[model samples]
Target: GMLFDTSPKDNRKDFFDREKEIEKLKGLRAPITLVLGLRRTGKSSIIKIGINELNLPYIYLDLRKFEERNYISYKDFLLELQKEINKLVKRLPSLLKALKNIQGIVIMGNEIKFNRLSFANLLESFEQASKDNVIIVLDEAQELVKLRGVNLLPALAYAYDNLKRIKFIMSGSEMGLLYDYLRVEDPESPLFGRAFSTVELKPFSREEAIEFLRRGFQEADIDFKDYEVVYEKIGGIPGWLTYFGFIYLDNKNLDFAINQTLEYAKKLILKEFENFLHGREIARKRYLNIMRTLSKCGKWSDVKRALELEEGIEISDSEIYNYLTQLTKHSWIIKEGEKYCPSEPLISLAFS
Candidate 1:
């Protein structure tokens, strides 16, 4: 519980806060709801708890399972759906009765099957199975943009309009990519003109971060670490705090744990930035150099001058502005007033 667990906390006892957000999740005004937040602000946890409290039939598919893959196929996504559906059947056997005769539905031993059914048909079964509304959460759903050989949007759009019994939650950390995938503003987009509820999560304040650490230590009944220094080193991303706590508890060495934690964040940035760099070779080398400087709340003049200094060439100002806006669109850097800021302290440290 608390600092010790790496998985998203499903119960309120282990979760820190977000009662209001969970409430918002449980009672939705639209068929589709977007859970938007930065990395590890407990977006998944809230969805789990809120959907758990709703006590309705639900399917949870974590698209982050394909994070390492450059591209995903329909088979890849359907496999996850199949597994989640099988798991759900164990909880609601009657629901399984309606899950038959689809093109992809396959059964070898009467218990499990390899189905080639369309996702729309899958949603249709889910719609008919439950007596009432059902929830389907696609965690890190922006990754769906990389889906090949199939277009899920048309299926998703159908469910939105036709499957009245289904509620969809597309939880995403990459806000820019999430919006890019949906393209609700584009008149030609499948989900265009769709009205959905947006639930955005924010990080803890310094005060709350301290209190969280204090409470977590008490939960473990362990000696307290230096709370102020912990916050100073890692800032308020709960995932980082939890890892540091777990490491500190094991090693009983604050410095070791902090170093280990920083190392973890370093590799995380490397991995995430790898995806950021995928097929982005156009500005590949420049992006790294840009991050090195952008880590410090860079602005228009600041970023432009930094790039120009490195290149020693006449770079146009308009082009540099595109880079800044591009980074913002990718959620690599966020806008604070007119200034651009790092999404988190650890991310800034990685570039440094």
Candidate 2:
């Protein structure tokens, strides 16, 4: 039967679109290439597809797997890095030779460890392993910013300037935060003034989204008659669309599938939102109030009024501005001209 596991690899063969995006990613010649999109816009699928099609030797790290904590110790970070390096070495045994002498990374019969591994040695090992070219892809790269004392910018900058064989491709859902971490625009930052190619993925249009659903259901041998309903409720985010298709195929019930998708997505999105709220406890009420307002009114004035009403006092513009700015910065909400809306449909539903 057909199945969807949320991870990009699970739906690899069933992947639908993003041909142009994939091409850009595959053809990247810059030291750094950024793939930016909101959650579930198929960034990972596009990236994985591009890497497979290019047949590039690559190391793929997904920071989402480390979301359990706000901070990661240097030791933990090195352990994860060693694990990925080991996976790469398994694919290309020659890589082990380059990494073996590197301090901190020990290559025992089948295990890799960071006894004295330095980030510089790790980058150099990647350079040594790059016979053709080595691509390092970090999905949800913005999460690395949360690892308080751990800084990767200098290493990346070194790769950019010296290691011509090593190239970086990063996918970030939280655009603003990702930029904050990169600090590419800041003159004092190590990566400042470096040119980075970018590919931004937009949500699917109504026509494209409907066709995707129709084809997906057809492939799965499911009767899907209400693409519009799904599109309306879930929008054009590929992950959510696939989720709906997967659930509907399982129960063969359209309404149940939609509801389940909503419920499940809401839970996941809310959990992420809660994670974002960790350090901002004082602003917790304001953030929730703003999200609730945008969930309904979805207009600047309406949201402002709602916030004021919820607090039972007049709110200052700077306060509202700061709240919205932070929310949008984290990719929780987006502003569309005169209105502000959750970046994804499920986020709006979660808030609602």
Candidate 3:
């Protein structure tokens, strides 16, 4: 394995604690609580942690990497949700009585399965199935709006207002999009009139980062100096920090650990970037130029100007802005004011 761990589950073994988050979510019987946090703030990892602690039946569907651009219509996505709900009902111990006669229902994605019925029929099937307490956590739930142009937020608001048994947790790193769709005061938005619990996770603070570093080194019975240096190398973002933290624990040498972390990051994210630019050749080069520059400079407008100076490749402001917008929309890189960074530090390290 070359001591390069990639999966979040593997990373969680060396995971640090999130006491504040635990407290915030304690006694939350809201059925549907949207965990909204910035990119790289450990949202998905929190979901995994909660599922284990609560012993709740949970399925984590990472919307970012789930499928290609071929999404179903918004109506069809709702139908799919209904189907999943019915499946959960049939699986419920108490509901099994109602679902005793039903064996299974068809599933579909990319292509329709044989003899799929209308949305009304899907509801009928669910009504017959025994309903159980089900939590469907949609990772990157913001993207669901892009499905079939059906304006899912209002529909989901209606469901949350009405449906008691099904708790929907929509989570994503792009809080902007999630807020746009879910904020009740946003009169122009679908979810303007409704509200559910929203959680925004901040990056780990210095103390939390210390706890993370100490725990990892303690687990391995190793000594680590120059923690400030390590923090600079990998920011306080838990996922990236955890990745390199484990490497330090395994290797016990900072230089060796950075080398291993860089390689591991590259293998994981480069393939993803390639897939993201699968068919768009123009986007490939433009995005690469933009991202590579940002990875080097860590500032957006400066990076664009630097590229112009160094490569003498002039690009229009509109072109750069549009590409930046596209990349942001696609969840490639994040922007704050003039500074731009990839969604995670790992993306920059991946290239290193």
For each of the candidates, the C-alpha root-mean-square deviation to the true structure, in angstroms, is: 2.3, 2.2, 5.6
TM-scores for every predicted model: 0.91, 0.92, 0.72
Tens-place lDDT per residue, model 2, 1-352, is: 2435456742346677677777788888598999999888888888877888777788888788777677877777666676777788877767888877876666678767776345666777777766778888898898898777777888889889998888889999889999999996799999998888899988889998898888777787656578888899888887888788878877888889989999889898989888888878998998888888888537767878887888898888888788888898899888888888888777878988
- Total clashes in model 2, counting residue pairs 3 or more apart in sequence or in different chains: 2
User: Tens digits of per-residue lDDT for model 3 on 1-352?
Assistant: 2122345442334346665664454334564677876665767766766655655544355676544554546445545555445445434544434333333433433222323224333223334342444456788787665564554454455556655655666787666666554554567764555546666677767777767777766666667776777677666776666678767766678888877766766786787678567657765666777777777436656757755776687868877777777677666677786777776666776654
Better of 2 and 3 by TM-score: 2
In candidate 3, stretches whose alpha carbon ends up further than 4 angstroms from where it belongs are: 1-6, 9-15, 26-32, 38-40, 56-91, 94-133, 143-146, 149-154, 177-189, 278-280, 296-316, 330-336, 341-352
TM-score of 1: 0.91
TM-score, cand. 2 vs. native: 0.92
Highest TM-score model number: 2
lDDT score at residue 246, model 2, on the 0-100 scale: 77
Candidate maximizing lDDT: 1
Please state the error at residue 33 of candidate 2 in Å.
1.5
Give the Cα lDDT of each candidate: 0.83, 0.81, 0.60
Better of 1 and 2 by TM-score: 2
